[PDB]
Design a protein around this ligand. Structure first.
Ligand SMILES: [Zn+2]
Ligand SMILES: [Zn+2]
Lengths: 218, 219
């Protein structure tokens, strides 16, 4: 069969990490966040398994948190599992309108809620969502947390120690550098960047990511 | 999803390579072989999925080949997901006894044939199968092709480019080096070693794999 892990990375911000076995390669890890506003919880990108999502919801309800919503950063396979489960529990699920329509076109579970512009904030200013343009996928969005000064980049960003753009099957490689530069133009006072895969780091992760992007489109 | 590739690597020996998309990491490859004996084809490890297995069968039958048998090197899927499909088409499927019983214990489709000893041959001498000991898994076997002088090591061996042992969830790391030394003790005149993942190489792959095993075992 290794199980979901949750760890505190700031006050009211927890990193959750799930694991899959890759035959021939080893273990690949995947991150998202739980963000607390008092005792209300928000999930950014659920575990890829419906199983590990189940465990994440229990992680929260066992601490007396009320899970208010989930946000999914894009439409890929691993982001669907949680949507279906949280829909079933009447927990509000959010994506961009575009991500929602992509999911519906692919016959996948759709979120119950969705925002239409390129910016949207959740909680009472707790989570600022932003669509910076195509990169990892055509629809990928990021989440900015103004209080903790953390950017959740998901797979649109690559961690420091990692050396490629990851799964690029649905990527817009020649658009990617420009999309990271759009995040940069927000002039968020970024203190930490959480990638979809790998270790958390500083704002450097964005520069690192443009390097990989600019290299590959050559 | 990138589809099955098949390429000739020796007279009568073809490398088949199947791909999976790994979110966060990229594309991973998995290798097996097809070995021909005139019109008769033998598959060493099926492809990773049923769909790619289907493509492998069509690759062979579009060429007029008769698929006589498959052999799977252990009870993990990148070796066995094709057993159900071949079973449906009444194509004999083989594993060791231990691999067969592991599959059955896990409620997985089992091969229609198996062998009991540490050695077995298929295709009347074409393919020599050997169980060297635990490593990648408790049950992993290798395949020696005396004509083409190819060793198929599967995930018991690691390509040069690989700097780790791969998926070690079911591994016996402290036994792994000995198990490779057991292969080496066979004195096969090895010209090429085909790993389960990554590029084909020479007998040096075996030394590389020993290095990796010994390093991980020290911890
Ligand atoms: Zn993705
Ligand atoms: Zn295996």
């Amino acid at each position: 069969g290794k199980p979901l892990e949750v760890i505190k990375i700031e006050d009211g911000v927890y990193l959750h990490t799930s694991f899959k076995n890759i035959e021939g390669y080893g273990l690949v890890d995947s991150n998202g966040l739980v963000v607390l506003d008092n005792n209300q919880a928000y999930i950014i990108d659920t575990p890829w398994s419906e199983e590990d999502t189940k465990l994440l919801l229990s992680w929260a309800t066992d601490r007396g948190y009320q899970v208010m919503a989930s946000i999914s950063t894009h439409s890929h396979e691993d982001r669907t599992a949680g949507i279906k489960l949280l829909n079933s529990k009447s927990i509000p699920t959010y994506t961009s309108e575009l991500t929602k329509k992509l999911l519906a076109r692919e016959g996948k579970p759709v979120p119950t809620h969705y925002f239409k512009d390129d910016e949207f904030t959740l909680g009472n200013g707790l989570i600022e969502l932003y669509y910076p343009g195509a990169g990892h996928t055509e629809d990928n969005i990021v989440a900015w947390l103004p209080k903790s000064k953390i950017l959740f980049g998901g797979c649109l960003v690559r961690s420091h120690e990692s050396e490629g753009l990851g799964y690029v099957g649905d990527a817009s490689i020649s658009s990617w550098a420009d999309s990271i530069k759009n995040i940069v133009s927000k002039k968020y006072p970024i203190q930490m960047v959480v990638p979809g895969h790998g270790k958390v780091g500083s704002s450097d992760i964005l520069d690192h990511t443009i390097d990989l992007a600019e290299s590959a489109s050559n």
